[PDB]
């Protein structure tokens, strides 16, 4: 065979794509959550950038791989449509490939694996919709003062729980204005 | 200069435990493909140059003799499996090494080995309680004679074989051979002989002890075979005229003494023939060949003699006629002589065969193989031996369970739902304990050439519908009920299998540092 | 379809696993205690079994998030599972690498 | 592939093995569709040869349901010109390659 | 050639220079020795795979067995090993204590020497704090033995000593060893571990074991004699066969007639030899070798009991008990070399014929514990647990004082010594505070073997001991880091067991610090 | 034998070069066919399962491999379907 480039296939190509996607996840892995640690970003000039935000890292992170650029574009779709949870999507997407690569070594064809995720993700949405909860605690019941009390317990402001949090509840209820179509 | 070990090889920690796990998988790899009746065979050659071919897991492990210390542990567990039960050495070795494979990634995560031991002790105790609940004793069920159920269990193990067409006839012979035994059942009692030529229906079932009788020598047209109450003598003495053992060499210058020396050499042989006649032994079974001159003596004395008899056939005869093996003819007496009701020389197959009948002390019988070649009979020899094991174990233990990986899947489902109810580190370990029990039904599909993934997946979903007896069918590829197909194994055998597998697994995990003293 | 769906359930456990490690707590014990509560909710509807139990990052233990007031919008969790599924499929569909 | 095997038995000479090799090479198309559908390539082709022997062209592989079913009932159909031109054009190329003994570079 | 080797003037012996710090690399040798036996401490201790010099596979968690099989070639490391041999004297426990604690002193001594403190000040710091430990230890004594010689009390104390050696058998071996020990206790000062002899027998399991009096041997009686009160016992290591003189005695066998003559001669030789035994009045003969078939006939002819013992150590036990020596020749008629025994009879326990040698008239401390087991490797380890259990009460023959176990005293004693080190000015306070932190190694090594975080256990122990609650040790559980009261659980150690262990382990670490250089010499 | 002139080495070279083209593209057959990653010399990558597009980006220098590219083009002109087949 005489060709102008390199061609390779087999379980190695799928293994390289899983290991490439696993490297991107391990970077934003320990930064998940409010207690996540900060991480430095060094450029070619030598400047440093520090922050714990996973969405900020993925935008400034530069790694050249064919599969890695798919997850980077994926976070942009989650950010523009919603804007939260971009870190969790990258972590889950990597764990899906880690377990799928193990099934390939079990002689499970990728088509059967793909058909499983489509049925599992469909049944997951149905089960979540039953366990949901609508807007409540706006009248007749208050557990909504404990809503901000949990987020205020991590600061020195949390010394008085019901005194400072009661004004936050009256502040969010007074600003309600339709402005569109109910 | 000053070194602590000085060539002493020792290691501890996580790498020492991981190295032992990889060594246990090598031992299980050799007996892995030999599981099941249809499993592939192995070929092992010793230093003599002879090759041993069989799928028996107990025989292969004895010939390996691995020098690894952790490998010798699993080998010793197989020896204890023979004394307690006598089979399942392949299942114990393959299953015990499967637990180490599942907990292997958990060890590298920093989990302490003592917690792993706590899981295998608790989960095994619950598996024993679940087997005793599922096990159902079948005796008078449906008012069926026990002989009918023993034949149906034998035809299933012999199905899809060379005898699968004639298995209906052979099932009666296997059951009848077991019924001829006494209350104490033993597999080493019943012998099996092979005879070339003839169809499969020509196979004969002999109640007494029969042997090939390789004796080719003269003495025909004499020695009447029918004896009402003969005295059976067991002698290893060689009656051959000119023999390698007993000769007479005397050098004299006297011509008249040559007539006596030639007579003295015949006198020693005549004395050995007279001592047999002195005790009144009608049947003479010799291990060494018998010369033509000694055959004419007993011929005129109305006594029969046959030589070239194997030692194993003489030991089975000793336990049959009731006598004992005597080396010389001097100590031959009524104490070592046996008795049989009917003795007849049969021409079946064209070869001369001898067998006894109605021996008072005989707990043993002999079966005759009839086929086209030797390979048909040698494989059928063990094929019928497995059928005898099923009938024997069915009589001893009447409480059984469904085989073919059926009980392995229920213990996997029951412990999977219980593991979720135990918050702690015990959840992941017991969950891996149930998954390791599924290696037995998986190896049956690979050894049978089927698809292990499609069968195991459809089988797992079938146990979710409540059927506890469903398992893998070795003949047709499908999920079938092993209880209605009459594939049964004793409950105490499966309990001892999980106990020995869990004990061998906890011992390897409990090993930390390997110390070797140079010497 | 069993192995494909079963591995999808184990892959979701990374979210409570990661939050337990960043909280300076044992991840094996918290996830184990977390799975025991949601199972008893599926066994029987009776109230004596815990329901809707989350994880407390400060104290490192199980806590009810309904009373604590830690919530997330529905479109956040739903769209996160859909996009993560499409990404795992797109990468898996590549059987070959050709260069020029 | 099934009918050309019977025609290979009636012929004589070198045409017996040559036509049979042409027939066995026609099973690569159904073996590939069964592989991408998540089935066993070797077992699926074997079952189709029996269904086509006793039955008609209706038997085939359905990639949407992932199993062997009636192709006409699944609304899968292709025009005849696609299959006829596939055998004609491919044969002319294979015959052209077999007629090439050596390549020579000129200037 | 210049430059020459640093500090080496003698016999090519490696001499570590000043920057090389010869003291630390000697500590490093003793540090690796502690790491091998650190994981064997406690009931959860990991088992070690040991290959005997005979290429036998042994698995045991005993620390004393490891030091015998593992050869320690480092001189400074032998000092701790030799301290362990002295640890087996005056008490039968505390072997794992010395190996772990002596290493803990040297590990923390490395931290002080890097600060620049002199080696002489570190030596004086331990000897001062060691005297404070011997004063506080009596105040930590909670309860003592009632000295009632009751099986319930005797078996209750063995629960701690049997623990950390044979696990799961703690309940069974408690009553078994108790029955043999309560027999000697009525004799004041006569109690000795050599008086209780252990004989292991292949069998079903440990549950089939029992306790008998006298000397019980697994080998049955070759003769038909049941019971005899004859005190004369002649031990003969030579096997019974045709008598051969130490002279030439050439026997020429030519013809079958002479073959029968010398064959009957051996029957006459064995006849006169056994006759000489009955003439001296000895009805009990012990055989170290095999026994001829004809010798069994003359044994019942003269009514002489015959005992066949294949083990060599079983013969030495009779030589040091009844006093019957084993003569090399075949049945020499020597009365002076015989023994004395009041009662000799054959018994059957566990469907096995056993021979019993005891004294009916004389009281005696003689007793035998019969053991049964399926695997000789696991059954031999039970014998190691019995010797540690019997030696535990050999100490209680002296003053009876008990201290809490499970690392309870180690935290209480480290808390009191820290107070004295703070009030004491000067440079001795550094070695005293490090001497108190050396006690922390035991509860850490005990927690790590149980799969529990070490720092979590140590933090809880200081909290409960600060409020004034004593008797609080470490609870043994995999998933539970918490602690429980040791006094109510029944875990108690020996006062003299800790007393002699701290003293010997202290001098072991001091002697190593005194040696700054190792030099080889030639005779 | 002898075979001073060996045309078979050209025949084996043509078959091996032609089979190598069909071995890659066969995975794209059918609606469920697998995709591929085509990296151009400039570094740009793309994902497509179309067989006709992949063959144009192969840039095959071997003569036997070029006739297969022309064979796939003649099929699209006549029928317009079944290029990969």
Question: Which residue among B176, B202, B246, B386 is the active-site one?
Answer: B386
How many CB atoms within 10 Å of residue B409? 25
Closest of E46, E79, E84 to residue E445, by C-alpha: E46
Instruction: Find all residues with CB under 8 Å of B198, minimum gap 6, and list them.
Output: B349, B370, B371
Asked if A15 and A63 touch (Cβ cutoff 8 Å), the reply is no
Instruction: Find all residues with CB under 8 Å of F66, minimum gap 6, and list them.
Output: F60
Q: DSSP for E10-51, please give it.
A: STT-----TTTTHHHHHHHHHHHHHHHHHTT-STTPPEEEEE
B327 belongs to the catalytic site = no
- Order the strands of the B488-490 sheet from edge to edge: B136-137, B399-402, B488-490
Phi then psi dihedrals of residue E107, to 5 deg: -65, -45
The count of CB pairs under 8 A between chains A and C is 176
Q: DSSP for E282-348, please give it.
A: --EEEESS---TTHHHHHHHTT-EEEE---HHHHHHHHTTT---EESSSS---STT----SEEEEEE
How many CB atoms within 10 Å of residue B94? 23
Phi then psi dihedrals of residue B269, to 5 deg: -70, -40
Instruction: Find all residues with CB under 8 Å of E266, minimum gap 6, and list them.
Output: E241, E242, E243, E294
CB-CB under 8 Å, A118 with C85: yes
Whether B167 and B235 share a structural domain: no
Exposure b/e, B300-312, CB count within 10 A at least 16 = b: eeebbbbbbbeee
> Could you tell me whether strands D67-70 and D59-62 are parallel, antiparallel, or unpaired per DSSP bridges?
antiparallel
Helix ranges restricted to H, E39-169:
63-69, 75-87, 95-115, 119-136, 151-162
Asked if F28 and F84 touch (Cβ cutoff 8 Å), the reply is yes
Whether B301 and B270 share a structural domain: yes
Token pair 């007074």 in the structure block, residue: A174
Whether B165 and B283 share a structural domain: no
Q: DSSP for E390-415, please give it.
A: HHHHHHHTS---EEETTTHHHHHHHH
Asked if B504 and B1 touch (Cβ cutoff 8 Å), the reply is no
B300 belongs to the catalytic site = no
Distances (CA, A) of E406 to A151, B185, E140, E206: 43, 54, 14, 27
How many CB atoms within 10 Å of residue B318? 18
Selected residue of D33, D36, D38, D66 to mutate for chain A interface (largest A Cβ count, 10 A): D38
For residue B181, how far is the Cα from the chain centroid?
18
How many CB atoms within 10 Å of residue A25? 20
Burial class (CB in 10 A: 0-12, 13-18, 19+), E15: middle
Q: How far apart are CA B431 and CA B426, in angstroms?
A: 8
Asked if B30 and B65 touch (Cβ cutoff 8 Å), the reply is no
- In sequence order, the β-bridge partners of residue B481 are B470
Distances (CA, A) of F11 to D94, E98, E254, F68, F70: 12, 83, 91, 15, 19
Closest of B281, E39, B67 to residue E48, by C-alpha: E39
Q: Integer distance in angstroms from the first to the last C-alpha of chain B?
A: 21
Whether B239 and B283 share a structural domain: yes
Closest of F76, F66, F73, F83 to residue F20, by C-alpha: F66
> What is the number of H-type helices and E-type strands within chain D?
5, 2
Maximum distance among all Cα pairs of chain D, rounded to whole angstroms: 60
Whether B221 and B174 share a structural domain: no
Asked if D12 and D20 touch (Cβ cutoff 8 Å), the reply is no
Q: Residue B272: helix, strand or coil by DSSP? A: helix
Phi then psi dihedrals of residue E348, to 5 deg: -130, 120
For residue A121, how far is the Cα from the chain centroid?
16
Closest of F84, F79, F3, F85 to residue F36, by C-alpha: F84
Dihedral sign from CA coordinates of B53, B58, B64, B65: negative
**Which residues form the domain of E271?**
211-397
> Could you tell me whether strands B479-481 and B470-472 are parallel, antiparallel, or unpaired per DSSP bridges?
antiparallel
Asked if B134 and B367 touch (Cβ cutoff 8 Å), the reply is no
CB-CB under 8 Å, D36 with F30: yes
Asked if D92 and D83 touch (Cβ cutoff 8 Å), the reply is no
Question: To one decimal place, what's the resolution in Å?
Answer: 3.8
Q: For the range F68-74, what are the long-range contacts, defined as Cβ-Cβ under 8 Å and sequence gap of 24 or more?
A: F68/D93, F68/F18, F68/F21, F68/F22, F71/D89, F71/D90, F71/D93, F74/D89
Closest of B226, B207, B175, B155 to residue B368, by C-alpha: B207
CB-side neighbour CA atoms (13 Å) of E232: 13
Asked if E37 and E66 touch (Cβ cutoff 8 Å), the reply is yes
Asked if B278 and B284 touch (Cβ cutoff 8 Å), the reply is no
Task: Give the CATH number of the domain where residue B215 resides.
Answer: 3.50.7.10
Token pair 């006690």 in the structure block, residue: E439
3-state secondary structure B359-401: CCCCCCCEEEEEECCHHHHHHHHHHHHHHHHHHHHHHHCCEEE
- Order the strands of the F35-39 sheet from edge to edge: A7-9, C94-99, F35-39, F45-47
Whether B231 and B334 share a structural domain: yes
DSSP state of D60: E
Q: How far apart are CA E198 and CA A1, in angstroms?
A: 81
* For C88, nearest residue in chain A (alpha carbons): A93
Residue E174 corresponds to which tokens in the numbers above? Answer: 């408690």
Distance (Å) from the C-alpha of residue C87 to the closest C-alpha of chain B?
27
Nearest 5°: CA angle at B118, between B113 and B120? 95
**Which chain A residues in 69-88 lie under 8 Å from chain D, judged by CB atoms?**
none
Asked if E112 and E430 touch (Cβ cutoff 8 Å), the reply is yes
How many CB atoms within 10 Å of residue E109? 27
Q: Residue D88: enclosing H or E segment and its boundaries?
A: helix D80-98
Task: Give the CATH number of the domain where residue E225 resides.
Answer: 3.50.7.10
Q: How far apart are CA C57 and CA C63, in angstroms?
A: 9
Dihedral sign from CA coordinates of B70, B75, B76, B77: positive
Whether B156 and B268 share a structural domain: no
**Which residues form the domain of B215?**
210-393
B89 belongs to the catalytic site = yes
Instruction: Find all residues with CB under 8 Å of A67, minimum gap 6, and list them.
Output: A16, A17, A20, A21, C91, C94
Whether B146 and B243 share a structural domain: no
Closest of B33, B35, B25, B27 to residue B102, by C-alpha: B25
Asked if E411 and E469 touch (Cβ cutoff 8 Å), the reply is no
Closest of A14, A5, A97, D85 to residue F27, by C-alpha: A14
Q: How far apart are CA A177 and CA A171, in angstroms?
A: 13
Distance (Å) from the C-alpha of residue C31 to the closest C-alpha of chain A?
16
Beta strands in D16-85 (DSSP E): 59-62, 67-70
> Is residue B41 a known part of a binding site?
no
The count of CB pairs under 8 A between chains B and C is 26
Q: How far apart are CA E461 and CA E456, in angstroms?
A: 9
Dihedral sign from CA coordinates of A150, A156, A158, A159: positive
Phi then psi dihedrals of residue B308, to 5 deg: 55, 40
DSSP state of B202: G
Task: Give the CATH number of the domain where residue B195 resides.
Answer: 3.30.260.10
Closest of B134, B242, B151 to residue B471, by C-alpha: B134
Could you tell me which chains touch chain E, where touching means 3 or more CB pairs under 8 A?
B
Whether B148 and B251 share a structural domain: no
- In sequence order, the β-bridge partners of residue A51 are A39
**Which chain B residues in 425-464 lie under 8 Å from chain A, judged by CB atoms?**
453
What count of residues does chain E have?
A: 523
- The torsion of the CA quartet A17, A18, A19, A21, rounded to 10 degrees, works out to 80
Method: cryo-EM
Asked if B465 and B458 touch (Cβ cutoff 8 Å), the reply is no
Whether B147 and B257 share a structural domain: no
Distance (Å) from the C-alpha of residue F41 to the closest C-alpha of chain D?
28
Residue E134 corresponds to which tokens in the numbers above? Answer: 């011997």
Dihedral sign from CA coordinates of E326, E327, E332, E333: negative
- Order the strands of the E215-217 sheet from edge to edge: E215-217, E353-358, E343-348, E227-228
Asked if E238 and E330 touch (Cβ cutoff 8 Å), the reply is yes
Asked if F28 and F34 touch (Cβ cutoff 8 Å), the reply is yes
Whether B322 and B310 share a structural domain: yes
Q: Residue E369: enclosing H or E segment and its boundaries?
A: strand E367-373
């Amino acid at each position: 065979l005489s060709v102008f480039g390199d061609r390779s296939t087999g379980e190695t190509i799928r293994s390289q794509n899983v290991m490439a996607a696993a490297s991107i996840a391990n970077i934003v892995k320990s930064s998940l959550g409010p207690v996540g640690l900060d991480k430095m970003l060094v450029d070619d000039i030598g400047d440093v950038t520090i922050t714990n935000d996973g969405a900020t890292i993925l935008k400034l992170l530069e790694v050249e791989h064919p599969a890695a650029k798919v997850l980077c574009e994926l976070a942009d779709l989650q950010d523009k449509e919603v804007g939260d949870g971009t870190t969790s999507v990258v972590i889950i997407a990597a764990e899906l490939l880690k377990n799928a690569d193990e099934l390939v070594k079990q002689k499970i064809h990728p088509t059967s694996v793909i058909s499983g995720y489509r049925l599992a993700c469909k049944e997951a949405v149905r089960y979540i919709n039953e366990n949901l909860i609508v807007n409540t605690d706006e009248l007749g019941r208050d557990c909504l003062i404990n809503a901000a009390k949990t987020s205020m317990s991590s600061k020195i402001i949390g010394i008085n729980g019901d005194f400072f949090a009661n004004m936050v509840v009256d502040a969010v209820l007074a600003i309600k204005y339709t402005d569109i179509r109910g | 200069v000053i070194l602590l070990k000085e060539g002493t090889d020792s290691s501890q920690g996580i790498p020492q435990l991981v190295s032992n796990i990889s060594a246990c998988q090598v031992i299980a790899e050799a007996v892995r493909t030999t599981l099941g009746p249809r499993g592939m065979d192995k070929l092992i050659v010793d230093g003599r140059g002879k090759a041993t071919i069989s799928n028996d897991g107990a025989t292969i492990l004895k010939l390996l003799d691995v020098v690894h210390p952790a490998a010798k542990t699993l080998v010793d567990i197989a020896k204890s499996q023979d004394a307690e039960v006598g089979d399942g050495t392949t299942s114990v070795t393959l299953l015990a090494a499967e637990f180490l494979k599942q907990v292997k990634p958990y060890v590298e995560e920093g989990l302490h080995p003592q917690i792993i031991i706590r899981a295998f002790r608790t989960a095994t105790q619950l598996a024993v309680n679940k087997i005793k609940e599922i096990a159902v004793t079948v005796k008078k069920a449906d008012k069926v004679e026990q002989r009918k159920l023993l034949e149906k269990c034998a035809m299933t193990a012999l199905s899809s074989k060379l005898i699968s067409q004639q298995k209906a006839f052979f099932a009666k012979m296997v059951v009848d051979a077991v019924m001829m035994l006494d209350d104490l059942l033993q597999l080493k009692m019943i012998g099996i002989k092979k005879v070339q030529g003839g169809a499969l229906e020509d196979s004969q079932l002999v109640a007494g002890v029969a042997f090939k009788k390789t004796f080719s020598y003269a003495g025909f047209e004499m020695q009447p075979k029918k004896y009402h109450n003969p005295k059976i003598a067991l002698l290893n003495v060689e009656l051959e005229l000119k023999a390698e053992k007993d000769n007479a060499e005397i050098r004299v210058h006297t011509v008249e003494d040559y007539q006596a020396i030639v007579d003295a050499e015949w006198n020693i042989l005549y004395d050995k023939l007279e001592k047999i006649h002195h005790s009144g032994a009608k049947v003479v079974s010799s291990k060494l060949p018998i010369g033509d001159v000694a055959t004419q003596y007993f011929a005129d004395r109305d006594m029969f003699c046959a030589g070239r008899v194997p030692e194993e056939d003489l030991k089975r005869t000793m336990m049959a006629c009731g006598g004992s093996i005597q080396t010389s003819v001097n100590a031959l007496s009524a104490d070592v002589l046996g008795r049989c009701q009917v003795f007849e020389e049969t021409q079946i197959g064209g070869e001369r065969y001898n067998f006894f009948t109605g021996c008072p002390k005989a707990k043993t019988c002999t079966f005759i193989l009839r086929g086209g070649a030797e390979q048909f009979m040698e494989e059928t020899e063990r094929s019928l031996h497995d059928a005898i094991m099923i009938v024997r174990r069915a009589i001893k233990n009447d409480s059984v369970v469904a085989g073919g990986g059926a009980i392995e899947m229920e213990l996997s489902k029951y412990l999977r739902d219980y593991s979720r109810t135990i918050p702690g580190k015990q959840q992941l370990l017991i969950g891996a304990y149930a998954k390791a029990l599924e290696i037995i039904p998986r190896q049956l599909c690979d050894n049978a050439g089927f698809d292990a993934t499609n069968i195991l997946n459809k089988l797992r979903a079938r146990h979710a519908q409540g059927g506890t007896w469903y398992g893998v069918d070795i003949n047709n590829e499908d999920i079938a009920d092993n209880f209605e197909a009459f594939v049964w194994e004793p409950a105490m055998v499966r309990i001892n299998a999980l106990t020995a597998a869990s004990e061998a697994a906890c011992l390897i995990v409990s090993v930390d540092e390997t110390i070797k003293n140079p010497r | 379809e069993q192995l494909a769906i079963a591995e999808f359930a184990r892959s979701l456990l990374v979210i409570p696993n990661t939050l337990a490690v960043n909280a300076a707590q044992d991840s094996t014990d918290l996830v184990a205690k977390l799975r025991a509560f949601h199972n008893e909710a599926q066994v029987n509807p009776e109230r004596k079994n815990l329901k809707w139990i989350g994880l407390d990052l400060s104290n490192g233990k199980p806590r009810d998030n309904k009373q604590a007031g830690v919530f997330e919008p529905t479109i956040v969790k739903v769209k996160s599972l859909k996009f993560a599924t499409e990404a795992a499929i797109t990468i898996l569909r590549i059987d070959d690498l050709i260069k020029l | 592939a099934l009918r050309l095997t019977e025609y290979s038995r009636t012929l004589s000479g070198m045409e017996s093995y040559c036509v049979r090799a042409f027939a066995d090479a026609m099973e690569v198309i159904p073996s590939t569709l069964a592989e991408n559908a998540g089935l066993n390539p070797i077992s699926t082709v074997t079952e189709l040869r029996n269904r086509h022997a006793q039955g008609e062209k209706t038997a085939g592989i359905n990639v949407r349901k992932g199993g062997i079913s009636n192709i006409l009932e699944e609304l899968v159909v292709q025009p005849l010109l696609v299959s006829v031109s596939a055998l004609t054009l491919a044969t002319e190329t294979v015959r052209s390659i077999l007629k090439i003994d050596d390549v020579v570079n000129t200037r | 050639k210049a430059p020459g080797f640093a500090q080496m003037l003698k016999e090519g012996a490696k001499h570590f220079s000043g920057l090389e710090e010869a003291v630390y690399r000697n500590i490093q040798a003793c540090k690796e020795l502690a790491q091998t036996t650190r994981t064997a401490y406690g009931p959860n201790g990991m088992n070690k795979m040991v290959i005997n010099h005979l290429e036998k596979l042994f698995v045991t968690n005993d620390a004393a067995t490891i030091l015998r099989e593992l050869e320690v070639q480092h001189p400074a490391a032998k000092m701790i090993v030799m301290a362990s041999h002295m640890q087996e004297q005056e008490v039968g426990d505390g072997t794992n204590f010395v190996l772990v604690f002596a290493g803990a002193l040297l590990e923390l001594a490395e931290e002080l020497l890097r600060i620049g403190l002199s080696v002489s000040e570190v030596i004086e710091g331990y000897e001062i704090a060691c005297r404070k430990a011997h004063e506080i230890l009596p105040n930590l004594v909670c309860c003592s033995a009632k000295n009632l010689r009751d099986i319930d009390e005797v078996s209750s104390l063995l629960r701690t000593s049997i623990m950390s050696k044979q696990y799961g058998n703690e309940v069974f071996l408690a009553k078994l060893i108790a029955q043999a020990c309560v027999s000697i206790f009525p004799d004041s000062g006569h109690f000795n571990v050599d008086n209780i002899r252990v004989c292991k027998i292949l069998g079903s399991g440990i549950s089939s074991s029992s306790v008998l009096h006298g000397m019980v041997f697994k080998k049955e009686t070759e003769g038909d004699v049941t019971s005899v009160k004859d005190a004369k016992i002649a031990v003969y290591s030579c096997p019974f066969d045709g008598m051969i003189t130490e002279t030439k005695g050439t026997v020429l066998i030519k013809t079958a007639e002479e073959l029968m003559n010398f064959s009957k001669g051996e029957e006459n030789l064995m006849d006169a030899q056994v006759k000489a035994i009955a003439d001296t009045g000895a009805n009990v003969v012990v055989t170290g070798g095999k026994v001829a078939d004809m010798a069994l006939h003359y044994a019942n002819k003269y009514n002489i009991m015959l005992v066949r013992l294949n083990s060599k150590w079983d013969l030495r036990r009779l030589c040091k008990t009844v006093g019957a020596t084993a003569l090399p020749r075949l049945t020499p008629p020597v009365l002076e070399e015989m023994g004395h025994c009041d009662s000799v009879y054959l018994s059957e326990v566990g469907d096995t014929q056993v021979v019993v040698f005891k004294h009916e008239k004389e009281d005696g401390a003689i007793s035998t514990i019969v053991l049964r087991g399926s695997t000789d490797n696991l059954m031999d380890d039970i014998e190691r647990a019995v010797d540690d259990g019997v030696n535990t009460f050999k100490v209680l023959t002296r003053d009876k004082r008990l201290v809490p176990g499970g690392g309870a005293t180690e935290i209480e004693l480290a808390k009191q010594i820290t107070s004295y080190g703070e009030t004491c000015p000067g440079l001795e306070q550094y070695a005293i505070k490090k001497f108190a932190e050396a006690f922390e190694a035991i509860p850490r090594a005990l927690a790590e073997n149980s799969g529990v975080k070490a720092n979590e256990v140590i933090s809880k122990l200081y909290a409960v001991h600060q409020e004034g609650n004593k008797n609080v040790g470490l609870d043994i559980e995999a998933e539970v880091p918490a602690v429980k009261d040791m006094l109510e659980a029944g875990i108690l150690d020996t006062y003299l067991g800790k007393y002699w262990a701290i003293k010997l382990a202290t001098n072991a670490a001091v002697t190593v610090l005194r040696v700054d250089q190792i030099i080889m010499a030639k005779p | 034998y002898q075979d001073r002139d060996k045309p078979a080495q050209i025949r084996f070279s043509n078959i091996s070069a032609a089979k190598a083209v069909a071995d890659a593209i066969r995975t794209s057959l059918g609606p469920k066919g697998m995709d591929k990653m085509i990296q151009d010399g400039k570094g740009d990558v793309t994902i497509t399962n179309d067989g006709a597009t992949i063959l144009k980006q192969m840039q095959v220098l071997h003569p036997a491999a070029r006739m297969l590219v022309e064979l796939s083009k003649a099929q699209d002109i006549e029928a317009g379907d079944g290029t990969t087949s």
